[PDB]
Nucleic acid binder design. Sequence first.
DNA 1: GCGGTTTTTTCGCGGGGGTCTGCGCGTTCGTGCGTTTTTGCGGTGCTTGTGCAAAAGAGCGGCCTCGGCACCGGG
Length: 75
Amino acid sequence: LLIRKLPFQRLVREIAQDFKTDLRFQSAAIGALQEASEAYLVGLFEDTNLCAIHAKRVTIMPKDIQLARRIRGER
DNA sequence: GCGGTTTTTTCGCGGGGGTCTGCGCGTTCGTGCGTTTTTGCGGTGCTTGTGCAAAAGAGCGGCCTCGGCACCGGG
């Protein structure tokens, strides 16, 4: 895993702090969340690279991300 | 639901060195200048055709009196 394990834990807790106050986490929940997040982001970067190559470029730009999320059907 | 075991999460500290960052020059790729090949709406001259004053005689149709006859009623 490329992201670390403690900043990601803090991010997850911060996000979870909105839906219910003072929620405990479990052995393999944060690990699964990190695996899913990194897999998702790698797929998104694959699609972004495809779009950037389509535009005859090598640099990925935010509009490529936006196009990828639009075609995937993401809101 | 309640008691058990014991893993691996949370807690804190020290050290390393890869990653971030200040600084410079160059270039490659982003942006504007100019153009290629073609599509489209703009108009015309000409073709082909349209709706908007008596006088007089001659001739005529209707008509009417009349001629003349056949006919009903009776013996």
